[PDB]
Structure 1
């Protein structure tokens, strides 16, 4: 019901549940939106709030931020693209007021905090606050609460690619690599004009860290899209046994538009200096499929792409990525084959078929030397579970491995890590929890000996999609995930006990 005796200002508020890390500045705890500007006759807005002792103990300062923009992420994540004023509050106070002139017509208010240096990082190590009152010239307004605040502390948490960064509207498709020397390489689709895939015009962008993810270089475009049907994306990364970094990606038309005579092409580029410089992209499509393929039985295949994220370099030195290949123009179906090189990338071959009606697939090395492959469930097949397969000949031949099944896949890319926990060999697997949607990015542990999956632990609640993972030299896990409906690519660091103990 809407009344007809004047204008009705409405107040909406959201508690924040993005992760945080020690020493971060101006982290949003609660956002408040007015439905309209303060009336011209207004003089002051007062905001009262609650903040428990445990959160107060973990912050060094509080602020009221005021912006003309209603932003999804912490305001410094937009690097000045969101303009805001910052009004300090003693961390002991529970109310604050601003003149209407200071507010200057703006509608969006952020209760924010500087995070202190300490944390235990346990599941219970979370920050919260609540806005309790919003009053204009002493008159309280009814508050519409849409979410509670709960920000979990992680050993590291940083949005590496945020919509607008560098002038790119959007970002998707995370890939992370740790080199033998400890360098971290983070790549992404720089989705410059919107969030859609090829044949849209897309670049590949990179950031590097030489201090374990504490700080990151300015983003660099390393492969520039040149127009619709001429973009590049879907990066996967390895480091070869010789030490060179190898990135594989696709470019051109979209997957379902690719044909044998006009393919969406697969390229590789290498770095011999920890990701500083990269070789001009080399087209390797002819090793895989299409009119230039020397295997006549693959010359009529239509499309191929390797799963974004990471490949796998075997102890022998064989370099592997799983391709998802379209063999027929009649159907929207893909089959998986391992794309591999035994000569440091000079030439490439295909395994026997690893999975029928597959999709983006990933490899990891079992403790006994076998290769485990994890296949995305496309089209809600069977019981909507993640699919698995095993190879005992270093990836040449495959058999379905139903014993690894037991986790739901809403239909999304994810990653695995082989880990040892309390003396047991286990596989960590990242996926959205769903169910049946891109929501709540989670990790699970599979115990090799019992054949049982753990309960999931949600790393990032809310909208969540592709994830990649790497082991850092000191045993911490780096988790690189698509957060939000308008995606930011976020790098989170934790140890397993932080999530499962």
Structure 2
């Protein structure tokens, strides 16, 4: 083995991890440091003592400390599991720097969490972070060597909440975030309820929603909107818009996997609408026949094999044209997709396709440029070219397209993300979310592209660690809502900030 293992008895081993998830004001029992014993305290043990450090700056920002003890070693803050993780909570005065528990109180458990309640104040600047470190763990007065695997650094944001966490509602997993703000200010958050594992269609997957009518301060209980009915009969990959008439429209796929779809046995595209701010939804309407396959009225598309619209959001143009970008498989000989805009000029009654927007594309998004042109951002799938994100432009409201290399300059490890057109210090810019990588789904970042200089900013990492798909919206009061896949076993996390919190 990698280490020398002695033969004079059993050896307890202690591992610790500092936490780096984001936080927000007033949150309760936020983990700062996790400590794991390799085995239960031995039968004759009487006490464990944990000593720690916590800088004045962090002390000033918390209202209370605790030691939590659990039989489970959890990834996220213990309240995020809604009781599915059992734990006891032992208060510590915020000024103290040591705490002790009897072995009887520990009751055989191995997992300890130094946690804090967060106060009401913050600057939200890049440097506005919370930290602590466990400095000693002693059993019956005998210290143990600590293996430190990460430092603690929790950034304060104006809002931070995991909206879908593994195990919620009985679903093992969650993926594929979509966020919509309506004109009346309602927030609709949807996801794939990946009930048995984290894998894609053709697994059995449902679509789930939560809603907020207070700007994301509080969220409704999750509701299953579309129920999967078995393998090959699931649903997922939601994108959302609100039409000019006010109705909400969700588009999604169901059925077999993307690469299993064929013209005669497709993975289908469905739409559903809500006329009451997402409280109720119409039964899913299959619109596959407008796109491809056996029932399509255009014989030139009746042998196309598959199509899916990119999860997250579409775009409703000033004209009222409703758009989503589809990635379409035109040949069964190749694992290649081409992008086309799927659009409706009649509030979703009928749907048409643009001319081809991008060859060898993948999930793509739209945004409205200051002068009315439409910008497409296309996922780079298969490490093409220089591993950069791809872009294209339309000046005819999405009907025809030309590649726009002048917008290229950010790396894409091959992942969905989102755009917002913003104005900052009088300048028209694009905010784009993607993982930073490089070459992997790590470090969820945002970048600003300055339209006039044609240059991208350095990235700002919003959420360090494993990070994948993201969607973003602009709240009415100027805040940005950023809805991201955090972690290897994903939770979908809604983070609120203003641009100056990240770029100032």
Class of the TM-score when normalised by the shorter of the 2 chains: over 0.9
- Structure 2 distance, partners of 1:44, 1:407, is 53
Equivalent-residue separation in structure 2 for 1:99 and 1:459 (angstroms): 40
CA distance in 1, matches of 2:221, 2:466: 26
What is the deviation of 1:417?
0.1
What secondary structure is seen at the aligned counterpart in 2 of 1:197? Answer: coil
Measure, in 1, the Cα distance between the counterparts of 2:52 and 2:43: 25
Write the distance in 1 (CA, Å) between the matches of 2:152 and 2:39. 24
Q: CA deviation at 1:66?
A: 0.0
Question: What whole-Å deviation, never above 9, does each CA across 1:286-310 have from its counterpart, x for those lacking one?
Answer: 0000000000000000000000000
SS in 1 for 2:105: helix
Take 1:475 and 1:332, find their aligned partners in 2: how far apart are those partners? 41
Q: 1:306 aligns with which of 309, 318, 321?
A: 309
Gaps of 5+ in 1: none
1:68 Cα deviation (Å)? 0.0
Deviation at 1:194, TM superposition (A): 0.1
Q: Deviations for 1:306-349, whole angstroms, at most 9, x for unmatched residues?
A: 00000000000000000000000000000000000000000000
Q: Structure 1 residue 167: deviation in Å?
A: 0.2
Provide the TM-score with structure 1 as the length reference.
Answer: 1.00
**CA deviations over 1:457-490 (Å, ceiling 9, x no partner):** 0000000000000000000000000000000000
TM-superposed deviation, 1:213:
0.1
For 2:206 and 2:214, the matched residues in 1 are separated by 26
List 4+ stretches of structure 1 deviating above 3 A.
none
Displacement after TM superposition at 1:381 (Å): 0.2
Deviation of residue 434 (structure 1)? Answer: 0.1
Pairwise CA distance, 1:261: 0.1
Task: For 1:395 and 1:251, locate their aligned partners in 2 and report how far apart those are by CA, in whole Å.
Answer: 26
SS in 2 for 1:77: helix
- Compute the displacement of 1:94 (Å): 0.1
Identify unmatched segments of 5+ residues in structure 2: none
Q: 2:31 aligns with which of 28, 31, 37?
A: 28
TM-score by length of 2: 0.99
Pairwise CA distance, 1:272? 0.2
- The separation in 1 between residues aligned to 2:261 and 2:410, in whole angstroms, is 32
Deviations 1:86-134 (A, max 9, x none): 0000000000000000000000000000000000000000000000000
Cα distance in 2 between the residues matched to 1:356 and 1:144: 50
Q: Could you list the per-position Cα deviations for residues 134-153 of structure 1 after superposition, in whole angstroms to 9, with x for gaps in the alignment?
A: 00000000000000000000
**Count of paired positions:** 501
The CA distance in 2 between the partners of 1:402 and 1:42, in whole Å, is 66
Q: Helix, strand or coil: the match of 1:367?
A: coil
Cα RMSD (Å)? 0.1
Shift of 1:278: 0.1
Aligned-pair CA distance for 1:40: 0.4
Counterpart-to-counterpart distance in 2, 1:159 and 1:251: 26
- Give the counterpart of 1:416 among 409, 415, 419: 419
**C-alpha separation in 1, matches of 2:178 and 2:83:** 26
- Partner Cα separation in structure 2 for residue 410 and residue 38 of structure 1: 44
